[PDB]
Design a protein around this nucleic acid. Structure first.
Lengths: 205, 194, 216, 77
RNA sequence: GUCCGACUUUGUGAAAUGACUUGAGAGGUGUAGGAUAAGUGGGAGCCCUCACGGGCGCAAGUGAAAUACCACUACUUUUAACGUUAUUUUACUUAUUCCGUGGGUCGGAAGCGGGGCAUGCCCCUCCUUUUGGCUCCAAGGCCCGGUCUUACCGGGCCGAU
RNA sequence: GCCCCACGAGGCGCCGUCAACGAGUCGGGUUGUUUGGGAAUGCAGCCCAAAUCGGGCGGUAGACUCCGUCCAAGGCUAAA
RNA sequence: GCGCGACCCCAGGUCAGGCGGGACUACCGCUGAGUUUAAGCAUAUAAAUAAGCGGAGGAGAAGAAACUUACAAGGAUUCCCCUAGUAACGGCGAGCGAACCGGGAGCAGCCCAGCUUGAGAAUCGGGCGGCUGUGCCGUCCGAAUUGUAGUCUGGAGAGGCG
């Protein structure tokens, strides 16, 4: 409990590099939730679901003699997989977790996307993304393709990131460290008030 | 590859950017915590995998804390009897690297697991931190994996204490390969200084 | 606004600016002025640390350039081939006095008996002939032909500026840029070992009416 | 505004080139820190004073990693 | 061992005071010559205009060199920019350090008392308070009560901001 | 002696686009220990600190130009 | 609050199993003297030895070059012969002091990380049933995308064509 509370506070106190603090400026809750509704269609298979599918396909192809199923469209996920898609420019949009314990891992992800000029978005909750995949940490998931029906509302999501970062690269702390400290804020108010009273009284009389 | 490439490049530059920022905060947390912290995530996933990482049961990553400094030689102010060329306490240094020291100490506590290799996860000013790969021999998955089944072998039991680890090779002068390195190779005691 | 517009520190290219088509815009002059090249050379006061040579420039200046020559005998006949106004040894006193309307100065070996009288006076604008700045030769006709064509003298100055004509503004851009480039090669060749960090430290092109712009 | 003077992208190309040149020279002629101190005087002395000192600080490395890592990605294609 | 310094350790910044990039200024200080002749490219033209005609060369004068015009350029000397870089001083809470506990009643605001300040309209810009007082007892059942779901049974809230 | 494991996978021949090749490690300074190793043999601590048409090595420190030679910083493996 | 999965971190006299000590001849590491020698003695010698400590096996360590070299180049590792009683080092005193090549013995070569399963974690542990069982099969939970299975390992290799 001691260490976990300190970690967020110390992010402010030390100067935070240009790659970070681009984070914390996260996607809106309204935008995030409607994104997940699109992903409701695309959700990846469970352990049971994949195993089940094999039985259906095996039966159909052997007995029915039917030609193979339609090409599956799902979100693609996992660090090494998704990052490769950014390079090839296959991914239209990637959704990137705010969190992740090795912060070194995830600084690369918006950085690479920005460099190649592929739109990305940073949403809060690594767990929230992970729920969709029905696993653990996804870290990233992305849409390489989208259905024609989903395409219209998908445009809103693409716009969404450049409706909180239609900006050049703000490289946060020039030298600044701190963020405001509870005791210091109270002290500053008292000091300011004394100064203001003195200054005003010279002009007045 | 992916972020594996990026994190490697970050960790070159200890004093700079994300690498300094994140790890500086984390090493302060480590001081508060014991010298036994098992973690379920690798700090460096790049160098876990370049020292042998398969994520799969029986595999663990673990943190070791071993001090910074020189050497301590017992009984100061009651100093050694002998000619003054060997009089020294802090003048002397260990000839083991601290990467291997972390392995020996970790293996002492975790005798039911066997050290593969170890790597560096920074320092402060009085403690030096390492994360060490230990992988069980007693769990089934290692035996039924043919890329790590060599570890199971009785010969590799407590290999860290015998200095046969990656770290143990480097301090033993096996860093080179040919001439000049020649007096280290199969043993320092090979010719036995005859 | 001529001062304000140009940025010295940025390194422009020869083709774009300086010795280029762009120079013509700076040229409004009724006469063809020669446009000259500056270089800021890490250098010392000494002659041997100096960058001194005479190079012949590949493409002409297209200028007749008046040298001051007072000479006698067959040397005087040779002078007439490539110089406007033949002069005898008596006439050198006019040049000695004050008059110094000439790009560089040349005298013959035959003439050299008389030239010693003039010598303090001619030194001051730096135009003076010398064996150091080879303008004293028996091959009088050959040398006068060369200087008229576009042979130039290169001499380091008292505050370490280096100089040579590198065209007239009227020339086409292609001619002008190669004329700059020959000087740069000579500067590196001549340059003393003792000098530190890049002998052509800065290179500027100018016009007399116009501003200067840095070219590298 | 200043740091040299005038422009952004044009300035960056030159400055970006200067830093690995200095790094290679120091590595392949040994020494390191104190040889850099001699080296700066025997250098142009505009961008170079600040840039060389920045190497012994950070340099500007996240920006460098994007370009170098992207180039490394094009060193696989 | 002890002492002393440096560096890691070490996060945050004030202003003093050294200095560097550039950028923009007042100027331009060696003999005679008034003096920008400080020195450079360049030089019969620069500039306003052109019936015409002028500033400065052209001349006058001195001498090693003579003066226009547009960059520039030592040296006397200064200022924005982004800060950069270096000395010391000084201050904050997060490293570290010390100590306090069967981590207790902390801090900030407001309830409620009430005072002092100009006590003026309360008086904020403030100071005391904020359930216990002589009186070798005693302060324990988070309490009786109030109040709501809830027949009683039984659960909340409040009493105790 | 029974299944022939084949039209798979790999091997070979030829062709292209690539070649991803392990960091506080390299390397260096300083100190101690050790070495025949001598302007540092290996080793370690501390301090500084990289790069990938790159890097290391080449028994005297150094710059310069060449040439030669391998490909670390992961790991197994009988025999003598 | 309750956060299905899970995230992060605790607890079972917990489910199936595992560790200590010995041996310590010989071996692999660590750590480390002095007597002695120099006719004294400190640098040096003894000795990178004895003592101290840990850990395996029938052998162990080593191991397919970031090597040796300077050649019509040798070619993982070990040991013997030789180099060698020598280059070198050393109050250049006492002493200290090996390797490279050459010959012989024995021989043996390899896989991961770092290019893509993405038509889908194809992989694995456990419980459970059956089985001819250092295993195999069906079934169900669980592990693992902060990456299992994997082509491929520098001698290379992945594509393509035949």
């Amino acid at each position: 409990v001691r260490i976990q509370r300190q970690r967020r506070i110390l992010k402010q106190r030390l100067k935070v590099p240009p790659a970070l603090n681009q984070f914390t400026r996260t996607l809106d809750k309204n935008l995030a939730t409607n994104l997940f509704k699109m992903l409701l269609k695309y959700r990846p298979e469970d352990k049971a679901a994949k195993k089940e599918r094999l039985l259906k396909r095996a039966q159909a192809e052997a007995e029915g003699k039917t030609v193979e199923a339609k090409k599956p469209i799902v979100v693609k996920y996992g660090l090494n997989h998704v990052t490769y898609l950014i390079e090839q420019s296959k991914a239209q949009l990637v959704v990137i977790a705010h969190d992740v314990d090795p912060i070194e891992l995830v600084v690369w992800l918006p950085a690479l996307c920005r460099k190649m000029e592929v739109p990305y978005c940073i949403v809060k909750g690594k767990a929230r993304l992970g729920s969709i995949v029905h696993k653990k940490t996804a870290s990233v998931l992305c849409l390489t393709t989208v259905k024609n029906e989903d395409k219209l509302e998908f445009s809103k999501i693409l716009e969404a990131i450049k409706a909180n970062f239609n900006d050049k690269f703000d490289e946060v702390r020039k030298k600044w460290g701190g963020g405001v400290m509870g005791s210091k804020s109270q002290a500053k108010t008292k000091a300011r008030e004394k100064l203001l009273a003195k200054e005003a009284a010279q002009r007045m009389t | 590859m992916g972020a594996y490439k990026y994190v490697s490049e970050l960790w070159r530059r200890k004093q700079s950017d994300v690498m300094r920022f994140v790890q500086r905060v984390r090493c302060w947390e480590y001081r508060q915590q014991p010298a036994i912290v098992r973690l379920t995530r690798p700090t460096r996933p790049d160098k876990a995998r370049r020292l042998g990482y398969k994520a799969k049961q029986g595999y663990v990553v673990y943190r070791v804390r071993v001090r910074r400094g020189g050497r301590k030689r017992p009984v100061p102010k009651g100093i050694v009897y002998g000619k003054p060329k060997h009089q020294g306490i802090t003048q002397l240094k260990f000839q083991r690297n601290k990467r291997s020291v972390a392995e020996e100490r970790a293996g002492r506590k975790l005798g039911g697991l066997r050290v593969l290799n170890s790597y560096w996860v920074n320092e402060d000013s009085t403690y030096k931190y390492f994360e060490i790969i230990l992988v069980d021999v007693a769990h089934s998955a290692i035996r039924n994996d043919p890329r790590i089944n060599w570890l199971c072998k009785p010969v590799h039991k407590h290999r860290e204490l015998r200095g046969l680890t990656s770290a143990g090779k480097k301090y033993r002068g096996l860093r080179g390969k040919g001439h000049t390195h020649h007096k280290a190779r199969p043993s320092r005691r090979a010719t036995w200084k005859r | 606004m001529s001062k304000l517009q140009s940025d010295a520190v940025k390194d422009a290219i020869t083709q774009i600016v300086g010795e280029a088509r762009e120079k013509k815009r700076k040229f409004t002059e009724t006469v063809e002025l020669q446009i000259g090249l500056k270089n800021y050379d890490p250098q010392k006061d000494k002659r041997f640390s100096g960058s001194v040579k005479l190079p012949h420039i590949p493409r002409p200046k297209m200028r007749v350039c008046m040298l001051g020559d007072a000479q006698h005998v067959d040397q005087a006949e040779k002078m007439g081939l490539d110089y406007m106004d033949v002069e005898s040894l008596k006439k050198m006193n006019k040049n000695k006095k004050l008059v110094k309307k000439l790009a560089k100065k040349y005298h013959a070996f035959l003439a050299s008996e008389a030239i010693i009288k003039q010598i303090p006076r001619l030194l001051g604008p730096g135009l003076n002939k010398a064996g150091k700045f080879p303008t004293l030769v028996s091959h009088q006709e050959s040398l006068e032909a060369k200087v008229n064509e576009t042979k130039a003298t290169v001499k380091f100055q008292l505050k370490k500026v280096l100089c040579m004509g590198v065209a007239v503004g009227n020339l086409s851009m292609d001619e002008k840029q190669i004329q700059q480039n020959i000087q740069m090669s000579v500067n590196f060749l001549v340059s003393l070992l003792k000098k530190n960090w890049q002998n052509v430290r800065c290179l500027y092109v100018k016009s007399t009416m116009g501003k200067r712009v840095r070219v590298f | 505004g200043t740091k040299r003077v005038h422009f952004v992208r044009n300035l960056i190309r030159e400055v970006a080139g200067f830093a690995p040149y200095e790094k290679r020279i120091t590595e392949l002629l040994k020494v390191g820190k104190d040889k850099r101190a001699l080296k700066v005087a025997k250098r142009k002395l505009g961008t170079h004073k600040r840039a060389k000192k920045k190497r012994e600080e950070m340099s500007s490395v996240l920006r460098k990693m994007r370009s170098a890592g992207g180039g490394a990605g094009d060193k696989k294609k």
